[PDB]
Amino acid sequence: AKAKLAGLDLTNSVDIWEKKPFLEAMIIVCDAIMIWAKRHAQLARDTAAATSDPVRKQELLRMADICEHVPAYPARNFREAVQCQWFVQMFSRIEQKASAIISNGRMDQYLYPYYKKDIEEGTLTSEEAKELLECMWVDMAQFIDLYINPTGNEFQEGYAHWEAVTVGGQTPEGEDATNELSYLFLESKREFPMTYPDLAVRIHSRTPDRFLYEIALTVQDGSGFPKLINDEEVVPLNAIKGCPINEALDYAISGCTETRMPNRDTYTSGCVYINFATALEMLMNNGRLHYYGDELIGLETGDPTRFQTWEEFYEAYKAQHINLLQKAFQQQHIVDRLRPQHFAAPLSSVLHNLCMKNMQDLHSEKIEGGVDYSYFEFLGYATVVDSLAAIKKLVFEEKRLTMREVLDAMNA
Amino acid sequence: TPDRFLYEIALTVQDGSGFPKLINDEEVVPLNAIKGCPINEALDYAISGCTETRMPNRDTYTSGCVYINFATALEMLMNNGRLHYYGDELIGLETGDPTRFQTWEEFYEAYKAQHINLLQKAFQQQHIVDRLRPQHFAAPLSSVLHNLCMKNMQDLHSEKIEGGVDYSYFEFLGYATVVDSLAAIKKLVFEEKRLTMREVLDAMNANFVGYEPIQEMLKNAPCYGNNDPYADSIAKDVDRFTQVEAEKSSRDRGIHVDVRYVPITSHVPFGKIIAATPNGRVAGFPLADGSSASHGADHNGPTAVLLSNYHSKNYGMINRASRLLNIKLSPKCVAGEQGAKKIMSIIRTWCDLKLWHLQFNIVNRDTLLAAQKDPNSYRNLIVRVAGYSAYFCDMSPDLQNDIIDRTEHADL
Amino acid sequence: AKAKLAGLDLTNSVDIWEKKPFLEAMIIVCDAIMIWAKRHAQLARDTAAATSDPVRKQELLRMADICEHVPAYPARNFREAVQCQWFVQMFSRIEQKASAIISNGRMDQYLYPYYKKDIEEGTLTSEEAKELLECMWVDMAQFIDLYINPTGNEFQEGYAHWEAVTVGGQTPEGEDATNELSYLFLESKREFPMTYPDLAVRIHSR
Ligand code: NA
Ligand code: NA
């Protein structure tokens, strides 16, 4: 950032305003996380001084040396690499409330070089590596998502959370990426059953049988891990939509089922959730929902018993359905316009190639070179489908019931 | 692909006439879509010519593309930019006396210089072709049948037609010849030092006459098509740095410039001008064609050939098109029900590996030589040669021996 | 042109075709006009040797020195500047048939630095400058616009020609550009009445 700043032309009319403030922000946020970490080193030294148990006292002193080095300097081993990861994901929580709580990336890939070097040099064992990872999970288990907005609380009932940890998949070169760490994460999830972390596994058409077996064993364990995401669906969609194929192959699972390319993704707006069951009811009730009485919420599609053919009834459904879609898209566009006025993410930006190249915060609307993957949520899919199919067969096809009959049964 | 249909395919392969050829949607469709073709049109592709994939209302590029004899890069490295066939004419780069190279690294870099020099001239030649063809060629019938020609009111052989996708090519001939020759020198001259550069040169200059032990030793060095990384990693890097150049040409020309390994019968004349090579091939003999194993070099069964193909590719790039891949099976190995299931299984593996093309040849070596002696008794012998179906008995000796000298895999 | 050519990337897919042939053409056309001028230098020497009159012999010999230097090298004085101009306008006729026959530009502006210097240093007088310009007119008067196509003949009947010579006007900085040469051109037109050159004056509010 300092070198980019030195490279600006601060005699011209524009750089001092368009570019220099962003780079000042980046310089400051680097200082912020490095200050925060150095404060943990002194605290470890002080807690050691006050600790008699001499094994713990030496643990804390190793911790102090660790925190003096990372994340200001490159990690030198697996222990430093994990504490660096930890500082970044915890300062991310300080930065902002990324949906589902900040996700953790392809840990089996980026920690493996540290892990393999340490094992081979005998400074680390697989049991010690599992311990450190499991320490991560127990402290992540103490950070609970506090939703104050009732809508958030009811959309994430029970402290819902998905700090995805990604293992397996392919390399940026398109070969299988399984390594000893990938197996270690799965062993650990069977041996240390708990709701943390959200272990998520990438599958592709050449996932090796031995690894897929290890996955099946984990599934058999019955703890609901790992979740599975399909490269063969994800990678071509994301690449077709503009992500370079090597970065698309290098994706991380994020939140519940999402796919992030950490130096290509640029869209960050929480997206609309559509209750499409309301379109069904409003079709049955002239644009009203019984929960709201006479309030016209949707379209006045008429007395439902007036529909003579399934085609006329399905077109009316589509009218209700598309009316919600149009308002959802309008709602989301406004959200996209307002969020940059309220939200920034300097730490996420300084770690983003495109934010640094363009000298823009990640929550800017348009970042040249980025790909913007946005969403709208379809809720009630099977409910709408089965309802429509029931009316299709019984009312219009087999004429075994009237619309009137069905209405009164539902009304009751 | 449904099992019932794949079985019908296997039964056709068993019939022994060399049909059908196979093209793999799982490689073709995402590449063409990533490159710009709308997914629905890409899924609707037609096979065209030998292995190519056309979208009849989206494709717009029609220029016959350059064919590169990369065995010349190898020989010119062994001969200070000369080819023996042309005497003292300086054709490529003056990379010097090959006995001077101290390290593999130096030798390989000089190979790259020769290889890249040929690419640079091939790309230039093609761009001139692209500029000249519209002045000589039109296709009014093809245009009237083409949505984009009709929308833009431009003939198909126009250079740029808005909305089109331009898939262009350059041909890599002699892939396995180059890879095996480089592997043989790396192993035997530079790593094990079992041979000096001078000795390999003298043997080659003699067409191995009187040097049969050196020839045997070169031939037993690691070869492409055995899933041996010693050689396949060379094949992968060669394909990779070729695509690096192709990405640059694509940017400068505004079209997709993709490496392709579709030989037609070009490996015969290309082989005629190439002296003996360090893999043990004698002077004037056909080059390795497509991405198949060099003649008789594959001794680990057909799956190994597929895996060498997979591991020599660069799936985190996109500047690739077809690879022509032929494997010859002994008819005993594929006879009856069990044999058809084995054909089915090879096809499923090839699909999962995202290989572009596959062609089976099911013929016994005795049948082939018997048909050379007594043609009248084998006039019904249909085989696959250079990619096309032919009556073996109508083929020239050059091509008969091309097919005969391929490995006949027996253990399927 | 050679420098632009050396600055191309002749390893890339396109420059060797899109740009190099143009720069090769420019290199060649520069040789063309230089070769043509040099053959004049030698013609002048040979003519001088065959000429008994001592005065004309010296004239032809100075001509040969002039044609050896210009247009290959920068003009060093008014006489070289005018003969340079003459080579460019005559070689332009060889190049093509520009309508009206090639025009001559702001002669009073680009010749003035040469004219002022030679005047001041005593190598040239205004009468000699006027004689040299008038030599231009009488040889321009022998180059007749030949229209074969009847349409051109009837749209320019009578050997119509407009080889414009511009005097006066404004400088690139928007001040009046009148100088001693501007007046010299108008004097010469009065003193030496003739249908060449097509003398055209720029007028402005000042
Ligand atoms: Na953004
Ligand atoms: Na075209």
PDB file of C-alpha atoms in Angstrom, chain A residues 98-326:
ATOM      1  CA  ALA A  98     -20.542 -11.135   7.392  1.00  0.00           C
ATOM      2  CA  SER A  99     -23.576 -13.375   7.037  1.00  0.00           C
ATOM      3  CA  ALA A 100     -23.342 -16.784   8.830  1.00  0.00           C
ATOM      4  CA  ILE A 101     -20.166 -15.584  10.616  1.00  0.00           C
ATOM      5  CA  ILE A 102     -16.940 -15.299   8.633  1.00  0.00           C
ATOM      6  CA  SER A 103     -16.108 -18.502   6.760  1.00  0.00           C
ATOM      7  CA  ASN A 104     -12.676 -20.132   6.903  1.00  0.00           C
ATOM      8  CA  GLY A 105     -11.612 -21.174   3.421  1.00  0.00           C
ATOM      9  CA  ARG A 106      -9.769 -24.234   2.124  1.00  0.00           C
ATOM     10  CA  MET A 107      -7.863 -24.938   5.335  1.00  0.00           C
ATOM     11  CA  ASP A 108      -6.523 -28.303   4.150  1.00  0.00           C
ATOM     12  CA  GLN A 109      -4.921 -26.527   1.176  1.00  0.00           C
ATOM     13  CA  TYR A 110      -3.383 -23.382   2.603  1.00  0.00           C
ATOM     14  CA  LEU A 111      -2.170 -24.993   5.863  1.00  0.00           C
ATOM     15  CA  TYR A 112      -0.793 -28.141   4.222  1.00  0.00           C
ATOM     16  CA  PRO A 113       2.679 -26.749   3.298  1.00  0.00           C
ATOM     17  CA  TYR A 114       3.191 -25.726   6.931  1.00  0.00           C
ATOM     18  CA  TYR A 115       1.797 -29.021   8.171  1.00  0.00           C
ATOM     19  CA  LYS A 116       3.898 -31.212   5.903  1.00  0.00           C
ATOM     20  CA  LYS A 117       7.130 -29.380   6.615  1.00  0.00           C
ATOM     21  CA  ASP A 118       6.640 -29.596  10.382  1.00  0.00           C
ATOM     22  CA  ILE A 119       5.731 -33.308  10.420  1.00  0.00           C
ATOM     23  CA  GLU A 120       8.765 -34.146   8.260  1.00  0.00           C
ATOM     24  CA  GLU A 121      11.031 -32.143  10.556  1.00  0.00           C
ATOM     25  CA  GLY A 122       9.473 -33.730  13.663  1.00  0.00           C
ATOM     26  CA  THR A 123       8.380 -30.407  15.182  1.00  0.00           C
ATOM     27  CA  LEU A 124       4.716 -31.438  14.919  1.00  0.00           C
ATOM     28  CA  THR A 125       2.617 -34.592  15.015  1.00  0.00           C
ATOM     29  CA  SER A 126      -0.798 -35.245  13.549  1.00  0.00           C
ATOM     30  CA  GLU A 127      -2.226 -35.441  17.085  1.00  0.00           C
ATOM     31  CA  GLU A 128      -0.830 -32.011  17.927  1.00  0.00           C
ATOM     32  CA  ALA A 129      -2.273 -30.586  14.694  1.00  0.00           C
ATOM     33  CA  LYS A 130      -5.707 -32.017  15.522  1.00  0.00           C
ATOM     34  CA  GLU A 131      -5.496 -30.503  18.985  1.00  0.00           C
ATOM     35  CA  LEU A 132      -4.797 -26.992  17.668  1.00  0.00           C
ATOM     36  CA  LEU A 133      -7.607 -27.219  15.110  1.00  0.00           C
ATOM     37  CA  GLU A 134      -9.993 -28.445  17.789  1.00  0.00           C
ATOM     38  CA  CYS A 135      -8.928 -25.513  19.981  1.00  0.00           C
ATOM     39  CA  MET A 136     -10.076 -23.294  17.106  1.00  0.00           C
ATOM     40  CA  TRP A 137     -13.491 -24.966  17.076  1.00  0.00           C
ATOM     41  CA  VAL A 138     -14.091 -24.631  20.809  1.00  0.00           C
ATOM     42  CA  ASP A 139     -13.406 -20.904  20.777  1.00  0.00           C
ATOM     43  CA  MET A 140     -15.463 -20.439  17.599  1.00  0.00           C
ATOM     44  CA  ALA A 141     -18.161 -22.269  19.568  1.00  0.00           C
ATOM     45  CA  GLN A 142     -18.137 -19.408  22.103  1.00  0.00           C
ATOM     46  CA  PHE A 143     -18.813 -16.696  19.467  1.00  0.00           C
ATOM     47  CA  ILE A 144     -22.567 -16.732  18.872  1.00  0.00           C
ATOM     48  CA  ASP A 145     -24.392 -14.725  16.221  1.00  0.00           C
ATOM     49  CA  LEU A 146     -26.356 -11.973  17.926  1.00  0.00           C
ATOM     50  CA  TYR A 147     -29.332 -10.954  15.790  1.00  0.00           C
ATOM     51  CA  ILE A 148     -31.207  -7.953  17.162  1.00  0.00           C
ATOM     52  CA  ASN A 149     -33.503  -7.379  14.182  1.00  0.00           C
ATOM     53  CA  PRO A 150     -36.330  -9.914  14.679  1.00  0.00           C
ATOM     54  CA  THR A 151     -36.248 -10.753  10.971  1.00  0.00           C
ATOM     55  CA  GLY A 152     -32.650 -11.883  11.316  1.00  0.00           C
ATOM     56  CA  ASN A 153     -33.372 -13.733  14.519  1.00  0.00           C
ATOM     57  CA  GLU A 154     -36.295 -15.604  12.933  1.00  0.00           C
ATOM     58  CA  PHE A 155     -34.306 -16.302   9.732  1.00  0.00           C
ATOM     59  CA  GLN A 156     -31.454 -17.686  11.866  1.00  0.00           C
ATOM     60  CA  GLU A 157     -33.375 -19.371  14.724  1.00  0.00           C
ATOM     61  CA  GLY A 158     -31.343 -20.947  17.487  1.00  0.00           C
ATOM     62  CA  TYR A 159     -28.058 -19.054  16.965  1.00  0.00           C
ATOM     63  CA  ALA A 160     -27.866 -20.489  13.428  1.00  0.00           C
ATOM     64  CA  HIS A 161     -24.326 -20.298  12.023  1.00  0.00           C
ATOM     65  CA  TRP A 162     -22.208 -21.664   9.148  1.00  0.00           C
ATOM     66  CA  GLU A 163     -18.492 -20.902   9.500  1.00  0.00           C
ATOM     67  CA  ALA A 164     -17.698 -23.120   6.540  1.00  0.00           C
ATOM     68  CA  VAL A 165     -14.425 -24.996   6.537  1.00  0.00           C
ATOM     69  CA  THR A 166     -13.632 -26.342   3.080  1.00  0.00           C
ATOM     70  CA  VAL A 167     -11.674 -29.526   2.466  1.00  0.00           C
ATOM     71  CA  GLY A 168     -10.954 -31.488  -0.669  1.00  0.00           C
ATOM     72  CA  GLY A 169     -11.848 -30.510  -4.215  1.00  0.00           C
ATOM     73  CA  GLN A 170      -9.406 -29.648  -6.958  1.00  0.00           C
ATOM     74  CA  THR A 171      -6.300 -27.527  -7.313  1.00  0.00           C
ATOM     75  CA  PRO A 172      -6.207 -24.385  -9.503  1.00  0.00           C
ATOM     76  CA  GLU A 173      -4.705 -26.749 -12.114  1.00  0.00           C
ATOM     77  CA  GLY A 174      -7.778 -28.958 -12.089  1.00  0.00           C
ATOM     78  CA  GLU A 175      -6.420 -32.081 -10.375  1.00  0.00           C
ATOM     79  CA  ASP A 176      -7.675 -33.640  -7.185  1.00  0.00           C
ATOM     80  CA  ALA A 177      -6.508 -31.737  -4.106  1.00  0.00           C
ATOM     81  CA  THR A 178      -6.841 -34.392  -1.374  1.00  0.00           C
ATOM     82  CA  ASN A 179      -3.910 -34.490   1.070  1.00  0.00           C
ATOM     83  CA  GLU A 180      -3.193 -35.877   4.576  1.00  0.00           C
ATOM     84  CA  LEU A 181      -4.749 -32.785   6.150  1.00  0.00           C
ATOM     85  CA  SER A 182      -7.985 -33.386   4.219  1.00  0.00           C
ATOM     86  CA  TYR A 183      -8.219 -36.759   5.997  1.00  0.00           C
ATOM     87  CA  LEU A 184      -7.226 -35.283   9.352  1.00  0.00           C
ATOM     88  CA  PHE A 185     -10.197 -32.891   9.246  1.00  0.00           C
ATOM     89  CA  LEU A 186     -12.547 -35.836   8.661  1.00  0.00           C
ATOM     90  CA  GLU A 187     -11.007 -38.022  11.385  1.00  0.00           C
ATOM     91  CA  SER A 188     -11.304 -35.060  13.766  1.00  0.00           C
ATOM     92  CA  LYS A 189     -14.976 -34.527  12.990  1.00  0.00           C
ATOM     93  CA  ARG A 190     -15.749 -38.150  13.826  1.00  0.00           C
ATOM     94  CA  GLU A 191     -13.479 -38.303  16.894  1.00  0.00           C
ATOM     95  CA  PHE A 192     -14.500 -34.836  18.244  1.00  0.00           C
ATOM     96  CA  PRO A 193     -18.241 -34.663  17.510  1.00  0.00           C
ATOM     97  CA  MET A 194     -19.606 -31.160  17.887  1.00  0.00           C
ATOM     98  CA  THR A 195     -21.523 -28.576  15.873  1.00  0.00           C
ATOM     99  CA  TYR A 196     -18.302 -26.719  14.965  1.00  0.00           C
ATOM    100  CA  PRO A 197     -16.869 -26.329  12.450  1.00  0.00           C
ATOM    101  CA  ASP A 198     -19.286 -26.502   9.500  1.00  0.00           C
ATOM    102  CA  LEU A 199     -17.156 -29.041   7.685  1.00  0.00           C
ATOM    103  CA  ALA A 200     -17.878 -28.872   3.982  1.00  0.00           C
ATOM    104  CA  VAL A 201     -16.336 -31.096   1.315  1.00  0.00           C
ATOM    105  CA  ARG A 202     -15.895 -30.373  -2.381  1.00  0.00           C
ATOM    106  CA  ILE A 203     -16.698 -33.310  -4.679  1.00  0.00           C
ATOM    107  CA  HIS A 204     -15.795 -33.680  -8.339  1.00  0.00           C
ATOM    108  CA  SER A 205     -16.002 -36.391 -10.970  1.00  0.00           C
ATOM    109  CA  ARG A 206     -12.489 -37.647 -10.049  1.00  0.00           C
ATOM    110  CA  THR A 207     -12.722 -37.598  -6.287  1.00  0.00           C
ATOM    111  CA  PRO A 208     -10.610 -40.661  -5.338  1.00  0.00           C
ATOM    112  CA  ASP A 209     -12.473 -43.687  -3.976  1.00  0.00           C
ATOM    113  CA  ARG A 210     -10.374 -43.788  -0.790  1.00  0.00           C
ATOM    114  CA  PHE A 211     -11.334 -40.183  -0.004  1.00  0.00           C
ATOM    115  CA  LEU A 212     -14.980 -40.696  -0.892  1.00  0.00           C
ATOM    116  CA  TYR A 213     -14.876 -43.703   1.458  1.00  0.00           C
ATOM    117  CA  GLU A 214     -13.523 -41.538   4.265  1.00  0.00           C
ATOM    118  CA  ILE A 215     -16.386 -39.145   3.516  1.00  0.00           C
ATOM    119  CA  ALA A 216     -18.932 -41.957   3.651  1.00  0.00           C
ATOM    120  CA  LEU A 217     -17.505 -43.085   7.001  1.00  0.00           C
ATOM    121  CA  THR A 218     -17.961 -39.550   8.310  1.00  0.00           C
ATOM    122  CA  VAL A 219     -21.551 -39.505   7.024  1.00  0.00           C
ATOM    123  CA  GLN A 220     -22.159 -42.903   8.681  1.00  0.00           C
ATOM    124  CA  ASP A 221     -20.964 -41.388  11.969  1.00  0.00           C
ATOM    125  CA  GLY A 222     -24.358 -39.659  12.084  1.00  0.00           C
ATOM    126  CA  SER A 223     -23.290 -36.139  13.174  1.00  0.00           C
ATOM    127  CA  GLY A 224     -24.489 -34.565   9.925  1.00  0.00           C
ATOM    128  CA  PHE A 225     -21.039 -33.931   8.474  1.00  0.00           C
ATOM    129  CA  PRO A 226     -19.653 -33.158   6.048  1.00  0.00           C
ATOM    130  CA  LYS A 227     -21.933 -31.195   3.771  1.00  0.00           C
ATOM    131  CA  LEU A 228     -21.194 -31.745   0.069  1.00  0.00           C
ATOM    132  CA  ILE A 229     -20.767 -29.199  -2.750  1.00  0.00           C
ATOM    133  CA  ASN A 230     -20.391 -30.319  -6.412  1.00  0.00           C
ATOM    134  CA  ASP A 231     -17.464 -28.782  -8.386  1.00  0.00           C
ATOM    135  CA  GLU A 232     -19.050 -30.192 -11.527  1.00  0.00           C
ATOM    136  CA  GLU A 233     -22.010 -27.867 -11.050  1.00  0.00           C
ATOM    137  CA  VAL A 234     -20.271 -24.900  -9.391  1.00  0.00           C
ATOM    138  CA  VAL A 235     -17.080 -24.465 -11.398  1.00  0.00           C
ATOM    139  CA  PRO A 236     -18.608 -24.252 -14.894  1.00  0.00           C
ATOM    140  CA  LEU A 237     -21.399 -21.904 -13.760  1.00  0.00           C
ATOM    141  CA  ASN A 238     -19.004 -19.542 -12.012  1.00  0.00           C
ATOM    142  CA  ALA A 239     -16.520 -19.635 -14.902  1.00  0.00           C
ATOM    143  CA  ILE A 240     -19.207 -19.161 -17.535  1.00  0.00           C
ATOM    144  CA  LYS A 241     -20.336 -16.136 -15.537  1.00  0.00           C
ATOM    145  CA  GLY A 242     -16.859 -14.668 -15.907  1.00  0.00           C
ATOM    146  CA  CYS A 243     -14.576 -16.131 -13.215  1.00  0.00           C
ATOM    147  CA  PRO A 244     -11.150 -17.240 -14.586  1.00  0.00           C
ATOM    148  CA  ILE A 245     -11.134 -21.022 -14.574  1.00  0.00           C
ATOM    149  CA  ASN A 246      -8.076 -21.401 -12.318  1.00  0.00           C
ATOM    150  CA  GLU A 247      -9.698 -19.178  -9.687  1.00  0.00           C
ATOM    151  CA  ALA A 248     -13.074 -20.871 -10.194  1.00  0.00           C
ATOM    152  CA  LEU A 249     -11.415 -24.256  -9.507  1.00  0.00           C
ATOM    153  CA  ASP A 250      -9.925 -22.736  -6.356  1.00  0.00           C
ATOM    154  CA  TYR A 251     -13.235 -21.821  -4.755  1.00  0.00           C
ATOM    155  CA  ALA A 252     -14.065 -21.940  -1.058  1.00  0.00           C
ATOM    156  CA  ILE A 253     -17.371 -22.980   0.423  1.00  0.00           C
ATOM    157  CA  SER A 254     -18.858 -20.028   2.267  1.00  0.00           C
ATOM    158  CA  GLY A 255     -21.774 -19.851   4.633  1.00  0.00           C
ATOM    159  CA  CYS A 256     -24.395 -22.486   3.948  1.00  0.00           C
ATOM    160  CA  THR A 257     -23.793 -23.535   0.310  1.00  0.00           C
ATOM    161  CA  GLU A 258     -22.117 -20.569  -1.360  1.00  0.00           C
ATOM    162  CA  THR A 259     -18.968 -20.480  -3.454  1.00  0.00           C
ATOM    163  CA  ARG A 260     -16.413 -17.732  -3.070  1.00  0.00           C
ATOM    164  CA  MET A 261     -13.347 -16.854  -5.115  1.00  0.00           C
ATOM    165  CA  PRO A 262     -11.557 -14.597  -2.604  1.00  0.00           C
ATOM    166  CA  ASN A 263      -9.732 -12.450  -5.145  1.00  0.00           C
ATOM    167  CA  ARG A 264     -12.524 -12.306  -7.759  1.00  0.00           C
ATOM    168  CA  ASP A 265     -15.865 -12.075  -5.963  1.00  0.00           C
ATOM    169  CA  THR A 266     -16.975  -8.500  -5.366  1.00  0.00           C
ATOM    170  CA  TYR A 267     -20.713  -8.594  -4.540  1.00  0.00           C
ATOM    171  CA  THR A 268     -21.686  -8.446  -0.862  1.00  0.00           C
ATOM    172  CA  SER A 269     -25.360  -7.365  -0.525  1.00  0.00           C
ATOM    173  CA  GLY A 270     -27.686  -9.503   1.526  1.00  0.00           C
ATOM    174  CA  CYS A 271     -30.432 -10.507  -0.874  1.00  0.00           C
ATOM    175  CA  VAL A 272     -34.225 -10.652  -0.746  1.00  0.00           C
ATOM    176  CA  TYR A 273     -36.080 -13.755   0.481  1.00  0.00           C
ATOM    177  CA  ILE A 274     -39.375 -14.358  -1.338  1.00  0.00           C
ATOM    178  CA  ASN A 275     -42.246 -16.266   0.336  1.00  0.00           C
ATOM    179  CA  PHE A 276     -43.727 -17.731  -2.841  1.00  0.00           C
ATOM    180  CA  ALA A 277     -46.456 -19.546  -0.917  1.00  0.00           C
ATOM    181  CA  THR A 278     -47.988 -16.064  -0.625  1.00  0.00           C
ATOM    182  CA  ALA A 279     -48.450 -16.129  -4.404  1.00  0.00           C
ATOM    183  CA  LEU A 280     -50.416 -19.356  -4.127  1.00  0.00           C
ATOM    184  CA  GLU A 281     -52.664 -17.996  -1.340  1.00  0.00           C
ATOM    185  CA  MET A 282     -53.154 -14.646  -3.031  1.00  0.00           C
ATOM    186  CA  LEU A 283     -54.209 -16.527  -6.138  1.00  0.00           C
ATOM    187  CA  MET A 284     -56.771 -18.377  -3.963  1.00  0.00           C
ATOM    188  CA  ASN A 285     -57.839 -15.119  -2.230  1.00  0.00           C
ATOM    189  CA  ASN A 286     -57.908 -12.243  -4.737  1.00  0.00           C
ATOM    190  CA  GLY A 287     -54.557 -10.846  -3.702  1.00  0.00           C
ATOM    191  CA  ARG A 288     -55.103 -11.150   0.039  1.00  0.00           C
ATOM    192  CA  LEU A 289     -53.534 -13.248   2.735  1.00  0.00           C
ATOM    193  CA  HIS A 290     -55.777 -14.389   5.558  1.00  0.00           C
ATOM    194  CA  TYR A 291     -53.056 -13.451   8.058  1.00  0.00           C
ATOM    195  CA  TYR A 292     -53.529  -9.810   6.964  1.00  0.00           C
ATOM    196  CA  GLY A 293     -57.294  -9.728   6.417  1.00  0.00           C
ATOM    197  CA  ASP A 294     -58.626  -7.536   3.636  1.00  0.00           C
ATOM    198  CA  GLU A 295     -55.288  -5.800   2.915  1.00  0.00           C
ATOM    199  CA  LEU A 296     -54.590  -6.030  -0.803  1.00  0.00           C
ATOM    200  CA  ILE A 297     -51.021  -7.361  -0.824  1.00  0.00           C
ATOM    201  CA  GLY A 298     -50.755  -8.896  -4.304  1.00  0.00           C
ATOM    202  CA  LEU A 299     -52.809  -8.789  -7.490  1.00  0.00           C
ATOM    203  CA  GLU A 300     -56.603  -8.855  -7.752  1.00  0.00           C
ATOM    204  CA  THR A 301     -56.747 -12.022  -9.827  1.00  0.00           C
ATOM    205  CA  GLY A 302     -60.470 -12.562  -9.003  1.00  0.00           C
ATOM    206  CA  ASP A 303     -62.713 -15.268  -7.592  1.00  0.00           C
ATOM    207  CA  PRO A 304     -60.662 -18.453  -8.003  1.00  0.00           C
ATOM    208  CA  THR A 305     -63.753 -20.548  -8.738  1.00  0.00           C
ATOM    209  CA  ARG A 306     -64.095 -18.495 -11.932  1.00  0.00           C
ATOM    210  CA  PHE A 307     -61.106 -20.204 -13.597  1.00  0.00           C
ATOM    211  CA  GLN A 308     -62.402 -22.576 -16.273  1.00  0.00           C
ATOM    212  CA  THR A 309     -59.083 -24.132 -17.383  1.00  0.00           C
ATOM    213  CA  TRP A 310     -55.771 -24.995 -15.780  1.00  0.00           C
ATOM    214  CA  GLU A 311     -54.093 -22.716 -18.302  1.00  0.00           C
ATOM    215  CA  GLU A 312     -56.048 -19.694 -17.082  1.00  0.00           C
ATOM    216  CA  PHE A 313     -55.365 -20.675 -13.466  1.00  0.00           C
ATOM    217  CA  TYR A 314     -51.654 -21.151 -14.050  1.00  0.00           C
ATOM    218  CA  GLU A 315     -51.327 -17.828 -15.865  1.00  0.00           C
ATOM    219  CA  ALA A 316     -52.934 -16.152 -12.859  1.00  0.00           C
ATOM    220  CA  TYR A 317     -50.460 -17.868 -10.555  1.00  0.00           C
ATOM    221  CA  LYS A 318     -47.638 -16.603 -12.789  1.00  0.00           C
ATOM    222  CA  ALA A 319     -49.014 -13.096 -12.519  1.00  0.00           C
ATOM    223  CA  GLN A 320     -48.849 -13.339  -8.724  1.00  0.00           C
ATOM    224  CA  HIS A 321     -45.438 -14.989  -8.863  1.00  0.00           C
ATOM    225  CA  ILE A 322     -43.870 -12.466 -11.225  1.00  0.00           C
ATOM    226  CA  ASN A 323     -45.362  -9.528  -9.301  1.00  0.00           C
ATOM    227  CA  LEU A 324     -43.366 -10.587  -6.254  1.00  0.00           C
ATOM    228  CA  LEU A 325     -40.265 -11.178  -8.422  1.00  0.00           C
ATOM    229  CA  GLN A 326     -40.476  -7.656  -9.849  1.00  0.00           C
TER     230      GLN A 326
END
